[PDB]
RNA sequence: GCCAACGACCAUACCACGCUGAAUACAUCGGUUCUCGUCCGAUCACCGAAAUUAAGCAGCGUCGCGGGCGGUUAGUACUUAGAUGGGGGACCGCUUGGGAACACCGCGUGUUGUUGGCCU
RNA sequence: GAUUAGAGGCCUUAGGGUCGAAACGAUCUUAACCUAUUCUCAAACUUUAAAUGGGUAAGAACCUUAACUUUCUUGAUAUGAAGAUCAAGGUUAUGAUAUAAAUGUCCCAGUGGGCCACUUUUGGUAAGCAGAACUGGCGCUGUGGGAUGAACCAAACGUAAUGUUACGUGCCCAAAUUAACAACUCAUGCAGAUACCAUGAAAGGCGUUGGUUGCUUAAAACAGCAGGACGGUGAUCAUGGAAGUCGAAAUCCGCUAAGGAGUGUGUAACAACUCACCUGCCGAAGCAACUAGCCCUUAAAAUGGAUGGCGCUUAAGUUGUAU
RNA sequence: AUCUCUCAAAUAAUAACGGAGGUGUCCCAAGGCCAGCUCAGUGCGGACAGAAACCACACAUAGAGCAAAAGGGCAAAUGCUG
RNA sequence: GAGGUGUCAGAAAAGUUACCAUAGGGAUAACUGGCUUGUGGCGGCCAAGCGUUCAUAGCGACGUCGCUUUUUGAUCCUUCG
């Protein structure tokens, strides 16, 4: 007729992995991790320093104050519904780095770059991405073994 | 039996597998603050073997520890110690050796002179002013177990005798008896000056000569006999003093895949005409009876 | 009686009508709760920033005092 | 395993270092009680092997015989090296050492019962009694410090692992018994 | 005590499972679930029969305790006492709970107005799927007709609709009867209890060298 | 082609067995006076070398175990979405889209960092 | 974590034994145990792992370059960090949207009994019952349709004209008895007829219409009207008879186009007696097991009565479509 | 009033006198920390030695233990001993 | 800091009324009607059988599928001016 409290329904979240237990891989302190960093939340396990509740545990969110061994993350958790910004300490071992920034941080270099090399073509940019379009018209030559290769039923006896 | 046990199991890490780290040293040690984000640790490793002790400065880091240099026993023939690599006292001077093999680097040698004079007592470095505060390490034991006056802390008296700063006390230096402590410092200076070594050969110059047959033979290959074993060892520390060369190398090279030689590892081709005979080999000697 | 104690009909339709209200995108956010100095260091040198064009060359010169900087390479 | 052997000649693999030595023999009291029927079987181990022996108290309380949780039923005593090798042949003229076959563990160790101590070259001491002993011999080789070190452990093969065949040889050919292959 | 099965005829829950703590549950003789000639090898019967439904019906354990005992004494009439194998490919494990009145005795005046809803556990059923064997009958190819019409009769005790395969299997192996046979012929399968042995070449040698031996000497 | 110290990811590294291993090495190994610990110098601790490459370890072998990867089971099972679609009901079919899993077959057997070092 | 079935095994755990005084010599057997399998599963079991989802990012509040700052805790550039001012920066960094958005106050009114529904779901045997998750509705909502109705399907509503739409067109009832079709269906006390939805089963049926598999047949099948049908052998099993025959161990053949130790009446012997079979006869398809359409049977309730009504039956029923 | 697994429908939330349990305490060590050692069990051995103990060598991925419910977690520990 | 409110966001609190009362309630029972069927009552499918012999003249085990709601309940829809 529950939940309450604090840590319910964490058979799955801080269950560690298949074959994954043991010592924490010492990475994990070695990470440096700046102010206004991203970061995701893990909870892990087996360190119950300090764990994230399990609401936000799958969550990302930004750093703004590092400690000696833990990291003051700034996570966004719906209430209802006014998405309040929350301002939670975790540990790092319940800490990835982000990659959501990582792609994007190769896409400013390059669109620096392709106006780089354009700088001295001059034209033009072409910068912006675009979903996909439809492809063309082609036209394609059997060219290789002609047609039918032809599929027809016969499905069901048995 | 023991086959699903295979589906299940996974493996100590490593270096918990050969034995050679401990993980709970591991992440201690090199655990820096997350907010002095990347100023490293300089820890010291301290490695003994049978032959020849080892002792690098390092500090770790993602990717595998960087080390900043190293300094071995196998180096001081050079410097007068040609036999006898594993007293303390040569463990002593390997110490030493780091501790001015690493401030040449630094330039870290107008200032911390250290204690010229050794003679057994806790020197710890003084940060001398208006500029260049000295330089810190931690020492890094690892596997061995820190009894009272192992041959490991000489080494790290070898360095806060070099001039750097480590925090140290002096509860496992020898002759320190903690029954009670007896700051006896000049034990030190029979210990640190390998003396002790030579009277074993003092208390065994008249008993057995097959003794030298035993251990502390090929001294008198050298005549290295029991008397003068300081002045091998004050003769050292005004030696290590003068140069670190860094064990510059020019051989460049013999290295290259000589001779094969360590026996490829059969591509799938002949291990098939590997089982492609063995199948007809098992036949003929079916068809042998037949 | 029991016939409706707990329910959530209408609930994120409520919830979706004066909507859903994302928080802000602040330019400066509050210091509250950061690590107390750091946030004091940072209060000595925003006051020590004396210089925006004078001293900030200066001290070049002063680099030139050792012919520069050949050996600090290493720590 | 299709490894070709090829014999390169360095040694015929015969025993320049699987030299068979005997690694420890360790004794044991077994006597269900306490007190002085304790510390008389503690005082026959002091003057028998020259070390001073640790007691042992029991695992759990049987109460088939009333041991107890730290009862202390037990006294043993490990010797290693210089007092194996007299203690042990002090135990096989007892044994009229033509020893039955088993007595001998497959991992290469054998141990014996004894009864009548006194015949250990001691006085029969009458304050002190008659004790039962159970001996247990185990050998090694050159290199099983390996198995048992903090740094760079270790464990050794199929040998230097001591066969059953490697401890009945081995008292076959040294003391000379027989097995009694019954 | 006994209750009817026209109250409990669908998956309508998540299935309930044994626990190992309710002791006092009902200990019911569903315990046979072969009948036949169960020690033969795949030799001596290569003909198979299967009752394959066609719902995803929920069968009583009543119904499974008639489906053998009717194909068993036709099978001990018009096929001789041990040329077959009937076998219950399916398994009542689950649990019914049954809240009956029994509200005797008249003076106990608190009994239940909704107070309170625990269940009472008083059998099994077993739940099917659509193209799911319940029984599968191996033989020999003499007794096709006896058998077909053997399971007609074991039909009409199921609730439901079942459809009849013959197979093309061997009996009860995985493998295809014409195919059962290439690969046999050699050394490549095996005999075992009612099944066979499955391409025993990996590894290393002496089960292929010594299931080679035998097949030649 | 290697070795040691220190690692990183932590089985392609693990396990079993068998073979080989130049040099650098590591070990194995000799001792108990000191430091030092032990019921026991086995363990640790300290001294230094006679012996040995047996074993550790290193490299490999095996239609090996496992673990890794790929095809394939499969456009399958399931699933968003729609119908005044079928059926007495269970349930099914269609449309619009996302789309697995065991097994099975193959193919790989650690990759690497910093610092000294050997060079068969 | 339950769990069916057998297989293999030196075994020495072996239970009966057995050849043996026991066997300790050995034999199998049976129990386990071990090995490789195997049947079936699990709200409180997991190696694997979807769709539907949850989070964040997508540029000037940016990107680098510089030397400055700091008391510091860390650091020999008195480096790192976090900052304060300069230097360089192309075309502003997915798509489509903006009925305006942002923010205070009055936290002002009312409300804090909900019901219904798809899919999910728990208790109950079920319930127009009980309790939850999601979306949409009803409440508050009229109009069109479903004869009828709080929620179904269309559609949301200022007063009017014109025109054009989910349901329908035999008559009530606007518009098809379609100068459009193929078929299926006979229903003697309810033929059947607009999804929700107003109850219906399993199994049938030589009713009929289709099918899938199996035969036999033009060396003339099936259908109807001829012939032969025992002996070797009362060898044989059976004496309540066996002699061919209640029930048969067996067991072939001889005779021969075709006759079997034999096919028949609830015929105890012989025997009568007929089938099987063959050919005559006629000569085109025939026989059977299935399968699923409508129809039927199943199918039983109290005022008189309901595809909504009439009525309909090459339809005004049902399935597939067309103008 | 409160806790654990399930219900719960792969974020988190979710209900019924739904299902299985728990709590109102216990501990100067069962708190801290440094070092040392590894457990369930099985296997072969050893006077009195079966189930008898105890010594002893190999195997032993946690199948042990961690005051207590249940769930996670832990192997040079968070376990055992100092 | 402590002494405690366990109805645990925390009044200091025994019964009876068939002698009764008021405010209300169909937010709530007893009562008809409705929905429901464990119970009631119930007829086909398949035959192990019994039926001397003979399955189905007459019955029919284990199954299995449907039908009625005046009781028994189950609910709480309607009614307590």
Known sequence: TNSKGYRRGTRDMFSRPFRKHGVIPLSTYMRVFKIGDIVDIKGHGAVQKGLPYKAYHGKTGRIFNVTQHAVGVIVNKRVRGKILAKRVNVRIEHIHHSKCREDFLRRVKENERLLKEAKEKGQWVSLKRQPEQPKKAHFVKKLEEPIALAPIPYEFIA | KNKQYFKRYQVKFRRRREGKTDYYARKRLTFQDKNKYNTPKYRLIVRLSNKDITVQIAYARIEGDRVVCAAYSHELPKYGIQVGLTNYAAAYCTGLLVARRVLNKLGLDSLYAGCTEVTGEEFNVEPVDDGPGAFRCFLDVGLARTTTGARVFGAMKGAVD?????????????????????????????????????????????????????????????????????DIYKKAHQAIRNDPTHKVTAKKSSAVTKKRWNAKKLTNEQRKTKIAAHKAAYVAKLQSET | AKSKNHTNHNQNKKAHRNGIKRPLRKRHESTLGMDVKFLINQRYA?????????????????????????????? | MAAVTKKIKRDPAKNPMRDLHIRKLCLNICVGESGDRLTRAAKVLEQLTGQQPVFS??????????????????????????????????????????????????????????????????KYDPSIGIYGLDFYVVLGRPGYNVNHRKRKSGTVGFQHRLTKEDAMKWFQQKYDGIILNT | ???????????????????????????????????????????????????????????????????????????????????????????????????????????????????????????????????????????????KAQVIEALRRAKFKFPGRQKIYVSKKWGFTKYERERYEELRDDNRLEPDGCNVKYRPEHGPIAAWEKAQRDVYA
């Open chain 2, 162 to 230: 070099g001039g750097l700063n480590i925090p140290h006390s002096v509860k496992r230096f020898p002759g320190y008896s903690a029954e009670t402590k007896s700051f006896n410092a000049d034990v030190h200076r029979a210990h640190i000056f390998g003396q002790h070594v030579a009277d074993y050969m003092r208390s065994l110059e008249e008993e057995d000569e097959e003794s030298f047959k035993r251990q502390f033979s090929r001294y008198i290959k050298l005549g290295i006999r029991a008397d003068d074993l300081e």
């Open chain 3, 46 to 75: 925003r006051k020590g920033n004396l210089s925006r064009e004078e001293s900030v060359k200066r001290y070049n010169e002063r680099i030139a005092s050792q012919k520069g900087k050949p050996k600090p390479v290493t720590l």
């Open chain 4, 57 to 122: 108290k029991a695992r759990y309380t049987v109460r088939s015989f009333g041991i107890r949780r730290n009862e202390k039923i037990a006294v043993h005593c490990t010797v290693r090296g210089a007092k194996a090798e007299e203690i042990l042949e002090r135990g096989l003229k007892v044994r009229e050492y033509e020893l039955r076959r088993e007595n001998f563990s497959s991992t290469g160790n054998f141990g014996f019962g004894i009864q009548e101590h006194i015949d250990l070259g001691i």
């Open chain 5, 1 to 143: 005590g006994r209750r009817p099965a026209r109250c409990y005829r669908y998956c309508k829950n998540k299935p309930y499972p044994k626990s190992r703590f309710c002791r006092g549950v009902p200990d019911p003789k569903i315990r046979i679930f072969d009948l036949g000639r169960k020690k033969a090898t795949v030799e001596d019967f290569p003909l198979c029969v299967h009752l394959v439904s066609d719902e995803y019906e929920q069968l009583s354990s009543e119904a499974l305790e008639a489906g053998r005992i009717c194909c068993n004494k036709y099978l001990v009439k018009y096929c001789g006492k041990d040329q077959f194998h009937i076998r219950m490919r399916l398994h009542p494990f689950h649990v019914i709970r049954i809240n009956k009145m029994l509200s005797c005795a008249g003076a106990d005046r608190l009994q239940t107005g909704m107070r309170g809803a625990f269940g009472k556990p008083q059998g099994t059923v077993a739940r099917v799927r659509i193209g799911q064997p319940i029984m599968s009958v191996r033989s020999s190819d003499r007794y």
